[PDB]
Design a binder for this molecule. Structure first.
Ligand code: MG
Ligand code: MG
Ligand code: MG
Ligand code: MG
Ligand code: MG
Ligand code: MG
Ligand code: MG
Ligand code: MG
Ligand code: MG
Ligand code: MG
Ligand code: MG
Ligand code: MG
Ligand code: MG
Ligand code: MG
Ligand code: MG
Ligand code: MG
Ligand code: MG
Ligand code: MG
Ligand code: MG
Ligand code: MG
Ligand code: MG
Ligand code: MG
Ligand code: ZN
Lengths: 129, 146, 173, 242, 151, 36, 107, 125
RNA sequence: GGUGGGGUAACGGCCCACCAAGCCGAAGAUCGGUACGGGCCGUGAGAGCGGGAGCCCGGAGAUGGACACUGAGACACGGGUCC
RNA sequence: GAGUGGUGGCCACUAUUAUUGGGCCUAAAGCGGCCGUAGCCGGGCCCGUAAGUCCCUGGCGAAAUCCCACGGCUCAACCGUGGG
RNA sequence: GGUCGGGUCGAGCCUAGGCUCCGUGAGGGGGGAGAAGUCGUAACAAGGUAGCCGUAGGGGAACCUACGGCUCGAUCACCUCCU
């Protein structure tokens, strides 16, 4: 059965970009998927996106631009401290400032660069580069 | 086969038990922890041992080699067990006599065992009546008491 | 547990017989007249340790990291291996030849107190060289920049006489 | 100790507040029981031999002590094992010098020079207080000593107050209360040897100790345990401190 | 997929997303409650009442009106029946499954060698026990309630 | 017995079915003598 | 009355000398919260508390449980299934070193 | 002889293997079975740290107290009952909690005669 | 586990008298194997894997098994008793 | 190179124990098939709590041992004073 | 300090019962190397009766036969189903 809406969305996006699709539909929507999409848009990995209302949990329509090498969820959602980001960067990223780790903090969802500037930790939930 | 399991955040106990269970399939780990080598070693964990020669023999080399390898039967002082030991060198068997005492050590093959074209022999002679056998075979020294 | 054991200050090669490394090290040994491989290896290790400290300090941040960062630079310029306006990245361009040029044997030969490297080694070992008023008999001693120019013949040495036969032959070069 | 009290002390296991070379010898002086505790004092031999340098060996340090040349809180001390601790006064009259024993910024004991006049007074923090036979009050101080007061005075003394005492006569001359606006000097912990004024006091249930907030001169606020805060003045220090 | 047979059938209803009742529907809430009560008194299941209301009276589901009592929720057939005291004592799906199991057990008393049908009884009783666990968790069944075929 | 399908291959060995029969014949003799 | 806990006293009184509210028993040390899982012995209960332990090599957690035997005063009379607060005390039997001081949520 | 150190059993029921000899500071002593007699008899025990205990072995008198705070020294007739042990009353053994009969009536003992050396009782109405 | 005592420097099934049926266990009881614990030490890019004689802190023992006297402190390696 | 060889042990080599990070059609390896208990893993929205989790600050985790700068033995090994 | 009575604790010793371990041991049984003393030719090509799995019976020995199964089976003719 379905266990993880966010993992399905990111695997779907990475499959679609590899064959040159220009847009995708993320079928079970949720607020967390929306926050992740906002962060992805801020750094230029996707274009415009919009919420579409069924009678169900909603749908997201997303525009792709061919700027994603890879994107995926992080399971389990490891806790991380405010001065410990480097080893996770070496685990998931290809060079010292290449890409973003997406972090859930008690101040919201944000990239690991913004959280490191604020001086806070949180829970890792995704990577994109 | 699906995804490797368990991956969950709160599944530490099962993951640890899985790793412990399949570690017993590694023969290196099992032999060390159960101390199997110690249970059957005639040298009792030592790097060298002393014994008394009971007779001289010769062992045929394995195919497709040909030749006779000279060895001795040795009774160890510490526990009385009898083992076969090789005598390295050209003409080395002539420096050995019955009732002489020797010092033996491992022959140096794979897995701490035998080597070359003589399986079945695990040891080699290093000293004879407390004189280095290598010297005797070369010269430079004489075997005492005739 | 176990009490402390004193450990070697140099590292050995991972494989004893590699042709290219053997050729390179033979050239260095001939040029600087070192006595054995371990001596050379000692200096190599010193260099490695410097680089390992720079690699760790580049990827660090905080308050103790800065103090360590400036201490590394200060020590390197005190030994004379970097100029006064160098930065941390310059640590990564140091070569083994930079360190060997700081040996007291090399510096005694460079200043013109001996005619050959071998003669400089014998002068050091026999006690004919003073460094800032002190006699030192170790040819591998690394000379600080602040004392480099106060390096002369010992005031009690036979060579501290411009009419000595062996000194005139040294001066003829 | 399999069967009895320990009487020896290895150098490597000596207290961390002493200035002592820990690898030069095998043994250190095991201090005698006395006024302070082990963490806040040091044997007198290390003051005579190691700190001041008036003697080179233990044998001639003992001859100096036996002739009566050193005074601690106004009294002659001859025992080379005698513990000398926080806020004591060390006096040498044949040379005319006086010191107060105080902890460092790193927690180590040092000697602070003082005037001859200030050497007559010792501040004592009130550690405990009790009723005693005849219905009188006994005050128990931080250095282990005791004093008696009549029942009519019971409202002028409470725990954590400081009393300035004239030594060696042991006569009270001033009581300094523990309250907001008082001047304090920290004696233990991470913020040791810092000083300032009291801002707030906090308490907790089930016997956890109480904590104080202190403002320093440059205007910074820091916390410490209440029992680590030693009152030394009203709004200015009454003793000389570094 | 199907709980036991692992098939992946997809047939079902496709409800459009809407908030209000359509303009062409003239019935009010009171008429709808009266119709629901009348049909229940005629002896129909809750699923059957909705089928009749859709097919014959042109009423797409009663879950298009707000509850006149509680504005926090919409109307359902079971809620309407509860408001009048005609709601089922046992949940209907459990009741239908139990009824299927009783008929099958007397068939098996006369056909002891019909093993393929016996596995069907085993699967049905697995479904019944799943449902009783859920309903006891929610409080719709008493804590002492037990399922016993000999009853 | 446990399954070892590699033993059924014929290169350099006799047929496993008859090896199995021989093993079972040997095990019967041991069990009879264990009863006496 | 207060015993340093900061919690309301029980409804009625008792005569147990081992009661911290109405007798001579003193409490000092740790205070734990838990669930009763047994009440068969006279004036004794078993209290269980759950916690997570971190496994460094596997960077994951496992669940562990701590079981403690505590004295049950008659004025409180805790039963199986409810949440209790317990406080450390001087040895009372071979296995009993705590006392129940309050029921937080009756089962 | 009499050891008061630790149980040789775990609460699970498993056995414990001792890892050291018995220490002197862990030992007990024989109980004092304080009897009723015509004359008194007590002894003095040197205890840990060089302290003392007064152990009463035979008692002839008691100090009897009322609810008003007045005490009287009277002689003991016998032990009527003792809930500590089922046969102490037959043997006239006195402990804390025993019921004794005196010339002024029954009383309940409030002292520990094996530890304190005297018999103190409260008069029962 | 409870109630009433004894004993101890002191709390305690530490030991007794009386009343109950409790207590531990597949999240591994019980039993068996091996072993003094820690600070630390060897190795490896790290994650890890292996060891824990020598120095410091804690524990235990004085041919094996039992038991006492003196003393603030011992059931005492250069003190006492039995086998 | 005043050392250099032999024998035995542990780590590495080894992603031949695999959390990071391995395999199971034909090479070692998916229970003959299925139902289900504990455990692990679990769909969307709103309100509350604050156990997990993150940040700040009090009290602790002896010394020796480890890293850095400076100083004392000719330099070093070693030893001291400060920072970690 | 000797002698006697009573209570209680107790290493050791004796007898019997049950398990456990090391040392020899007549006789019996397969396993591994050696190199050939011997009888046959079962597997590899359609290996000259395709091979193999499960169960059962028979035979100097590899093996043979019966029922159900697999292709990890060659050749020719015909038929069926696809691209
Ligand atoms: Mg050790
Ligand atoms: Mg001793
Ligand atoms: Mg307290
Ligand atoms: Mg008592
Ligand atoms: Mg041992
Ligand atoms: Mg260990
Ligand atoms: Mg030793
Ligand atoms: Mg001996
Ligand atoms: Mg593999
Ligand atoms: Mg296979
Ligand atoms: Mg299968
Ligand atoms: Mg299932
Ligand atoms: Mg969810
Ligand atoms: Mg918290
Ligand atoms: Mg430390
Ligand atoms: Mg110097
Ligand atoms: Mg230096
Ligand atoms: Mg040092
Ligand atoms: Mg054939
Ligand atoms: Mg044929
Ligand atoms: Mg054939
Ligand atoms: Mg036949
Ligand atoms: Zn109560």
């Amino acid at each position: 059965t379905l266990l993880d809406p966010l993992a399905n969305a990111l695997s779907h996006i990475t499959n679609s970009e590899r064959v040159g699709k220009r847009e995708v539909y993320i079928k079970p929507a949720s607020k967390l998927i929306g926050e992740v999409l906002r962060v992805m848009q801020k750094y230029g990995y996707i274009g415009e996106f919009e919420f579409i209302d069924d009678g169900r949990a909603g749908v997201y329509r997303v525009q792709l631009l061919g700027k994603i090498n890879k994107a995926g969820a992080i399971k389990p959602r490891f806790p991380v401290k405010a001065r410990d980001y480097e080893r996770w960067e070496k685990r998931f990223l290809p060079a010292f400032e290449f890409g973003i780790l997406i972090v859930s903090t008690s101040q919201g969802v944000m990239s690991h660069k913004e959280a490191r500037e604020k001086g806070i930790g949180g829970r890792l939930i995704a990577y994109v580069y | 086969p699906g995804k490797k399991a368990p991956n969950g955040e709160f599944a530490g106990r099962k993951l640890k038990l899985k790793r412990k269970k399949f570690r017993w399939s590694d023969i290196r780990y099992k032999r060390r922890v159960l101390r199997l080598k110690e249970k059957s070693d005639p040298l009792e964990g030592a790097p060298q041992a002393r014994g008394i020669v009971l007779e001289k023999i010769a062992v045929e080399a394995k195919q497709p080699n040909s030749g006779m390898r000279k060895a001795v039967r040795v009774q160890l002082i510490k526990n009385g067990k009898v083992v076969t030991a090789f005598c390295p060198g050209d003409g080395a068997i002539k420096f050995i006599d019955e009732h002489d005492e020797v010092i033996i050590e491992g022959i140096g093959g794979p897995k701490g065992g035998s080597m070359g074209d003589i399986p079945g022999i695990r040891y080699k002679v290093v000293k004879v009546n407390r004189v280095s056998l290598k010297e005797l075979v070369k010269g430079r020294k004489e075997k005492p008491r005739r | 547990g176990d009490p402390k054991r004193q450990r070697k200050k140099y590292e050995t090669p991972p494989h004893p017989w590699i042709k290219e490394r053997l050729d390179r090290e033979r050239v260095l040994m001939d040029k600087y007249e070192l006595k054995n491989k371990k001596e050379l290896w000692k200096h190599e290790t010193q260099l490695k340790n410097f680089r390992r400290r720079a690699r760790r300090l580049l990827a660090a941040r905080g308050k103790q990291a800065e103090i360590e960062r400036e201490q590394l630079l200060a020590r390197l310029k005190r030994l004379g291996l970097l100029p006064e306006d160098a930065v941390l990245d310059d640590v990564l361009s140091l070569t083994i030849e930079d360190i060997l040029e700081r040996r007291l044997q090399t510096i005694v030969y460079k200043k013109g107190l001996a005619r050959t490297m071998r003669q400089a080694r014998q002068l050091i070992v026999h006690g004919h060289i003073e460094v800032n008023g002190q006699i030192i008999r170790s040819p591998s001693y690394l000379v600080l920049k602040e004392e480099e120019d106060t390096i002369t013949y010992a005031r009690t040495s036979p060579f501290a006489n411009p009419q000595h036969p062996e000194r005139m032959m040294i001066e003829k070069a | 100790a399999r069967k009895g009290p320990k009487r020896h002390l290895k150098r490597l296991a000596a207290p961390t507040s002493w200035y002592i070379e820990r690898k030069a010898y095998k043994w250190a002086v095991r201090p005698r029981p006395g006024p302070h505790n082990m963490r806040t004092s040091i044997p007198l031999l290390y003051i005579v031999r190691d700190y001041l340098g008036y003697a080179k060996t233990a044998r001639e340090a003992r001859k100096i002590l036996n002739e009566g040349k050193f005074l601690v809180d106004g009294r002659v001390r001859k025992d080379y094992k005698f513990p000398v601790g926080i806020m004591d006064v060390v006096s040498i009259p044949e040379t005319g010098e006086h010191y107060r024993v105080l902890p460092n910024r790193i927690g180590k004991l040092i000697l602070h020079p003082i005037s001859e006049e200030e050497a007559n007074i010792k501040p004592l923090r009130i550690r405990n207080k009790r009723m005693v036979k005849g219905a009188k009050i006994q005050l128990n101080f931080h250095d282990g000593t005791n004093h008696l007061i009549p029942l009519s005075e019971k409202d002028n003394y409470f725990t954590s107050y400081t009393v300035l005492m004239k030594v060696p006569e042991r006569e009270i001359l001033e009581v300094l209360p523990f309250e907001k606006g008082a001047y304090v000097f920290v004696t233990q912990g991470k913020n040791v040897a810092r000083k300032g004024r009291i801002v707030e006091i906090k308490k907790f249930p089930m016997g956890w100790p109480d904590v104080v907030t202190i403002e320093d001169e440059e205007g910074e606020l820091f916390d410490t345990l209440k029992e680590y805060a030693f009152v030394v003045g009203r709004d200015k220090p009454r003793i000389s401190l570094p | 997929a199907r709980m036991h047979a692992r098939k992946r059938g997809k047939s079902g209803s496709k409800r459009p997303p809407r908030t209000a009742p359509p303009i062409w529907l003239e019935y009010t809430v009171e008429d709808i409650e009266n119709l629901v009560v009348k049909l229940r008194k005629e002896g129909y299941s809750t699923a059957m009442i909705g089928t009749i209301l859709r097919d014959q009276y042109g009423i797409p589901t009663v879950k298009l009106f707000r509850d006149p009592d509680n504005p926090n929720r919409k109307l359902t057939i079971t809620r309407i029946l509860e408001k009048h005291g005609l709601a089922p004592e046992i949940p209907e799906d459990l009741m239908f499954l139990i009824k299927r199991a009783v008929n099958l057990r007397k068939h098996l008393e006369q056909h002891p060698k019909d093993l393929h049908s016996m596995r069907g009884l085993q699967l049905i009783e697995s479904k019944i026990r799943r449902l009783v666990k859920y309903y006891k968790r929610k409080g719709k069944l008493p804590k002492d309630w037990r399922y016993d075929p000999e009853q | 017995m446990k399954r070892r399908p590699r033993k059924w291959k014929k290169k350099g060995r006799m047929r496993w079915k008859w090896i199995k029969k021989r093993i079972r014949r040997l095990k019967r003799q041991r069990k009879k003598e264990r009863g006496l | 009355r207060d015993i340093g806990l900061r919690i309301q006293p029980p409804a009625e009184k008792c005569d147990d000398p081992k009661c911290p509210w109405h007798g001579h028993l003193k409490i000092h040390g740790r205070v734990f919260e838990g669930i009763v899982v047994s009440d068969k012995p006279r004036k004794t209960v078993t209290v269980e508390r759950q916690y997570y332990h971190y496994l460094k090599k596997y960077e994951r957690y496992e669940l562990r449980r701590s079981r403690i035997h505590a004295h049950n005063p008659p004025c409180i009379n805790a039963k199986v299934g409810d949440r209790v607060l317990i406080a450390e005390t001087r040895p009372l039997s071979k296995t009993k070193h705590f006392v129940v001081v309050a029921v937080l949520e009756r089962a | 002889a009499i050891w008061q150190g630790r149980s040789l059993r775990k609460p699970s029921g498993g056995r414990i293997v001792l890892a050291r000899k018995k220490r002197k500071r862990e030992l007990g002593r024989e109980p004092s079975n304080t009897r009723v007699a015509e004359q008194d008899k007590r002894k003095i025990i040197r205890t840990y740290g060089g302290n003392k205990k007064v152990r009463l072995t035979a008692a002839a008198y008691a100090n009897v107290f009322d609810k008003s705070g007045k005490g009287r020294k009277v002689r003991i007739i016998r032990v009527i009952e003792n809930p500590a042990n089922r046969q102490f009353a037959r043997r006239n053994i006195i402990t804390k909690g025993a019921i004794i009969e005196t010339e002024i009536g029954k009383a309940k003992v409030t002292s520990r005669p094996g530890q304190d050396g005297v018999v103190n009782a409260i008069l029962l109405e």
